[PDB]
C-alpha cells in the first residue's frame, strides 16, 4: 500500500520574512490502478483549504509519487502550531494521518562566539576559523560565513548536539588560506534562530 511522509519547512524559510515557509506531505507507492489521492489538511485541528497538489511523478518502480504542499505563516510555525496531513486512497483500508510541528519547549537564545586559529595551526597552508554556537533551543538553525558581503563557502558545520542543560550546541569551521588570514581580512559568522533579536546575529573575526 501507499505510505506517507510529512516534512517541516526549512529553518531559513521560517526565519526570513522575505521567504515562504511550507509543509510537505509526500505520498509514495501510489498504485497505477488507483492513482487518486485525497488530501485533507488541519492546523491545530482546524481544517484549512489552501494546499496545492504538485505535479504527479511516476517512479522507476512502477508507482506514483503524489505530493501536497501547504504554505504556512512564519509566526504560526514559530508559535508551535500543529499541522496535520490526512491521506485517503482506495488501496488503503483506512486513511493515513501524520502531524508535525516545531519541537516543544521554551526557546533559548544562541550564544555565538568566534575563535581564531590556534598558534600551533599557523605553520600550515590553511587555517581554521571557528564559530561556536551554544545554549540554543529549539535545535532549528542556520549558520553561514561571509566576508566583505560575499559568501565564504569553504566551511562545514557539525550537527546540533544536545547539551546537559537541555539546550543544543554546534560548531562551524571555515577553512581559509593562511595568507588571506594574514592579509587582515574580516570574516563573519552568521547565525539565524528564532530566539535571536530579529532572528539574526553576526560575529566577526580577524588577525589581532
Amino acid at each position: 500500500g501507499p505510505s506517507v511522509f510529512l516534512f517541516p519547512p526549512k529553518p531559513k524559510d521560517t526565519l526570513m520574512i522575505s521567504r515562504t515557509p511550507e509543509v510537505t506531505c509526500v505520498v509514495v507507492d501510489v498504485s497505477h490502478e488507483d492513482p487518486e489521492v485525497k488530501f485533507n489538511w488541519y492546523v491545530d485541528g482546524v481544517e484549512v483549504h489552501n494546499a496545492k497538489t504538485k505535479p504527479r511523478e511516476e517512479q522507476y518502480n512502477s508507482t506514483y509519487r503524489v505530493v501536497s504542499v501547504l504554505t504556512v505563516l512564519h509566526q504560526d510555525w514559530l508559535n508551535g502550531k500543529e499541522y496535520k496531513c490526512k491521506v485517503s486512497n482506495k488501496a488503503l483500508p483506512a486513511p493515513i494521518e501524520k502531524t508535525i510541528s516545531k519541537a516543544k519547549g521554551q526557546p533559548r537564545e544562541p550564544q555565538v562566539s568566534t575563535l581564531p586559529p590556534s598558534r600551533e595551526e599557523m605553520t600550515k597552508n590553511q587555517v581554521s576559523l571557528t564559530c561556536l554556537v551554544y545554549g540554543f533551543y529549539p535545535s532549528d538553525i542556520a549558520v553561514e560565513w561571509e566576508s566583505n558581503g560575499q559568501p565564504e563557502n569553504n566551511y562545514k558545520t557539525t550537527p546540533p548536539v544536545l547539551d546537559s542543560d537541555g539546550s543544543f550546541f554546534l560548531y562551524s569551521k571555515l577553512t581559509v588560506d593562511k595568507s588571506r588570514w594574514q592579509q587582515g581580512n574580516v570574516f563573519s559568522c552568521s547565525v539565524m534562530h528564532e530566539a535571536l533579536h530579529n532572528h539574526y546575529t553576526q560575529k566577526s573575526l580577524s588577525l589581532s
Binding site: 526565519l15 526570513m16 520574512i17 522575505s18 553561514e144 539565524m192 530579529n198 532572528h199 539574526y200
Partner: peptide, 13 residues
C-alpha cells in the same frame, strides 16, 4: 530596527 542577510531582509521588530 531590521536585520539583513546578504542584502535579503530577515526580520524587523
Amino acid at each position: 530596527d531590521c536585520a539583513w542577510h546578504l542584502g535579503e531582509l530577515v526580520w524587523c521588530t
